[PDB]
Ligand binder design. Structure first.
Ligand SMILES: */C=C/C1=C(C)C(=O)N/C1=C\C1=NC(=C\c2[nH]c(/C=C3/NC(=O)C(C=C)=C3C)c(C)c2CCC(=O)O)/C(CCC(=O)O)=C1C
Ligand SMILES: */C=C/C1=C(C)C(=O)N/C1=C\C1=NC(=C\c2[nH]c(/C=C3/NC(=O)C(C=C)=C3C)c(C)c2CCC(=O)O)/C(CCC(=O)O)=C1C
Lengths: 479, 470
């Protein structure tokens, strides 16, 4: 059924019946028999791959056939890209085997191929820069700027995805002309499950011309299975109408994205946008897929090194709490210490200490809410750690360290705030599509707002780790 | 100037006019004027080089000269390459630029391949190994295996260079007919200073054939400076006769290495040895060059991640020490404690604690020695911190934490512990190990700056406690 805003969350974009027109596609079954092909084989390649047929050396050349032959029956690895000029143009021919189907893709090459030396040199510079700077925010920033020098794209941004899958533009190099989307936030809904899986499975993804018209592949179904063809790993797999509308609203008509994958999760991706159709040669894209690997590798460690630091200041800051509580025998004093205090342990907008009936509220008037939270927990006598990002103050983390005299510690966070807003000279809409204003950056951001309304920043894994240890410390102190 | 074992430490391996015969070299000055070339240029290539000669289009083709042209007009260290025709035993023309000399190196592109020569394909495969592992040891162990699978070398090893630059075989996958070299410690003098400057500035080295026949370049002197050509960044640079003699004693005749550089140190390298002559294509070597950098990067933050962990357990067990010491007023109880004690604070074979006339030693008898040390610390009575590796036992790290009652804490470490050529057994693994034994005799594994940082921190902790006792 036709994709609407109402059902786009479930659009199966891995089994579209089409490909992008700047290439051709022939899908083969495990024994070499053609199962399907795209409308334009004869026009682009000058021959008709008929279902039931087997390709000949005559049709598609020795280079392609030899790859096709070692590629089909595929124990062990094999070169899966080949050059050949079947016609008058130049074709990179790319083959891969997913499920049990073999996809043979013909993509026209335009620009000079990858200069492997001048790519190695560029790889040095980037690794050398992040050698100096162990900010993962600096890596993103540098590689972003660098991607634009290399590719020549009009804009390249770096997205970081939070735990709730929402996105944030944490870097950007555009040409002076264009408006900046720096600091943009967008909801999980802007990158649906299927699209997200595809960003994890595929490092690089390219959209040559957004204002194109899809070239269908027939037959639509796989006669061997009576189900659609899975084009997850296809270089030419067509784009969604929804997205294409979104992109044209922005005035963008060529996209090129490099994934950053850590764990199973998609940690973020570099998005390259062009204002006119743009095509990047397969082997070049393959060099960028290397960046995808390197960044993912580096970013992973930079991140685990950061939580490592958080954990170090935590323990050191707990050590001070012991150096301090055991001397004068007053928790409150130690806990309320400005720099090393609990309000500084876990990032928050305020804290509250309870022991006996004594209440020390730090950075605001938190007794009332701490009182109300406690009344709730009264109906839940066995809970020792409470935390919610719903509820003055909607984020709450409570740990009980002494039950008899009801000793608790509370951290509070206010609603989540958009870090950086742009203002002044406002809003050149460019055309709006039929689907509505939802498919514009402003529409997306407003969609994010509605999502986070009433929610604080989520209690990190580490924030919870530190609090659980702090609770253990407080328990033994009271003993 | 013959290479003798005694002289070889100064051997200038970076200048010798010889190259390896599997390729051809042509050296030009800034303006494209030929200054020198190997005596096999016309053997492999169409024509003959000659000083004063500005490169002939007819012999080198359009791409190459056209490449050199854009290179010439660039004032930075030029590095580029193209694959092109020359009589149709076609080549990879790979050029660089050191000083103001332009070098063109010619490698034969071999049609018959049973493996994948795609630069992007190979690069993606090894680099994938980096993303997988957390151990810096696991990584080395696994990339070692993957390298042997990818290249098919008879043996591939991974070295780690300690503080004294003595290396250690930490990982190894071999053909099961070959003896194991795992653990082998060899002296720093098996890799001279010059060899190291090169391994550091060059991610990849390739010796195609060990019993090679040095293909001389003429002229030998650089006409302009009248001083030797520096082939530091050359691929086809000839190989030291001493090293070659070393490899032949081992029955090795083909060799490739991947450097690992963190900071400016040859942290370690992957060495591939083959028992028969072997050759890797240029683009595949570039596959390993970019891996060298990526691996270096990841290894660095894997290491600094490791010390960060060390420091966390330090602050952690240091915290427990403080708790234990404040709970019951007596220090010794927490210092002597098994897992959270000082003996487990810093890698050591033993520990000792002095406070007043009361001395407590952990895991050994260090009282006699603690005394001697303490006695040398009579001089410089202001010395709060001390450490060394020479001296009974040789690893001594001492900190003072209480002046009035001579409160000291010590950590102690023990000492670390048939077809040969004309130079003798010195150039065999057996010789190397022995040589290393000589070097390490009176030295214990050095105290890392992390060990010292921990001791230094501990010391501060203790003083604070003693002041608080009052
Ligand atoms: C009904 C589902 C979708 C809605 C709603 C929507 O807006 N897009 C939907 C589907 C897809 N989005 C895909 C990629 C994609 N979309 C965005 C969204 C943005 N939100 C913003 O605020 C901004 C810019 C300010 C953007 C661009 C992004 C960031 C991406 C990733 C690629 C890119 O950055 O261009 C997508 C995949 C298409 C494909 O196959 O490439 C689908 C489907
Ligand atoms: C007189 C100086 C040298 C001595 C002594 C020596 O053994 N080699 C000397 C000069 C050079 N060594 C070079 C490289 C090199 N040598 C070793 C030595 C080993 N010691 C061992 O115990 C084992 C094995 C158990 C070995 C292999 C190594 C490891 C290396 C690095 C390269 C490799 O691993 O093969 C060297 C550089 C030669 C070049 O140009 O590649 C010089 C010069």
């Amino acid at each position: 059924t036709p994709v609407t805003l109402a059902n786009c969350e479930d659009e199966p974009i891995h089994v579209p019946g089409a490909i992008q027109p700047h290439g051709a596609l022939v899908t083969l079954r495990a024994d070499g028999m053609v199962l399907a092909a795209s409308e334009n084989i004869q026009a682009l390649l000058g021959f008709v791959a008929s279902p039931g047929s087997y390709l000949t050396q005559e049709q598609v050349g020795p280079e392609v056939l030899r790859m096709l032959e070692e590629g089909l029956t595929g124990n062990g690895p094999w070169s899966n890209s080949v050059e050949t000029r079947i016609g008058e143009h130049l074709f990179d021919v790319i083959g891969h085997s997913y499920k049990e189907v073999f996809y043979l893709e013909f993509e026209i090459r335009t620009a000079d191929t990858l200069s492997i030396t001048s790519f190695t040199l560029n790889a040095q510079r980037i690794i050398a820069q992040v050698q100096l700077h162990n900010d993962t925010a600096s890596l993103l920033s540098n590689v972003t700027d660098e991607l634009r020098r290399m590719t020549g794209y009009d804009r390249v941004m770096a997205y970081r995805f939070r735990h709730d899958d929402s996105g944030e533009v944490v870097a950007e190099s555009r040409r002076e002309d264009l408006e900046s989307y720096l600091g943009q936030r967008y909801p999980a809904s802007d990158i649906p499950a299927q699209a997200r899986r595809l960003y994890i499975q595929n490092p690089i993804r390219l959209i040559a011309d957004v204002a194109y018209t899809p070239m269908r592949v027939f037959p639509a179904l796989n006669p061997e299975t009576n189900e659609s063809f899975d084009l997850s790993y296809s270089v030419l797999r067509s784009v969604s109408p929804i997205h294409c509308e979104y992109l044209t609203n922005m005035g963008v008509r060529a996209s090129m994205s490099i994934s950053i994958v850590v764990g199973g999760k998609l940690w973020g991706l570099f998005s390259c946008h062009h204002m006119s159709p743009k095509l990047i040669p397969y082997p070049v894209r393959m060099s960028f897929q290397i960046f995808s690997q390197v960044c993912s590798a580096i970013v992973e460690r930079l991140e685990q090194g950061r939580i490592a630091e958080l954990l170090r200041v935590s323990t050191e800051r707990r050590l001070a709490l012991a150096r301090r509580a055991r001397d004068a025998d007053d928790l409150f004093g130690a806990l309320a210490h400005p720099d090393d205090g609990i309000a500084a342990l876990i990032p928050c907008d305020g804290a509250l200490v309870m022991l006996g009936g004594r209440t020390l509220s730090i950075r605001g008037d938190f007794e009332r809410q701490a009182g109300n939270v406690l009344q709730r927990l009264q109906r839940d006598p066995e809970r020792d750690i409470y935390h919610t990002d719903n509820w003055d103050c909607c984020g709450v983390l409570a740990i009980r360290f002494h039950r008899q005299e009801s000793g608790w510690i509370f951290w509070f966070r206010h609603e989540e705030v958009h870090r950086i807003r742009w203002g002044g000279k406002p809003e050149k809409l460019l055309t709006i599509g039929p689907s509505g204003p939802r498919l514009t950056p402003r529409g997306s951001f407003e969609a994010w707002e509605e999502v986070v309304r009433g929610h604080s920043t989520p209690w990190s894994e580490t924030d919870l780790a530190i609090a659980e240890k702090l609770r253990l410390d407080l328990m033994e102190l009271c003993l």
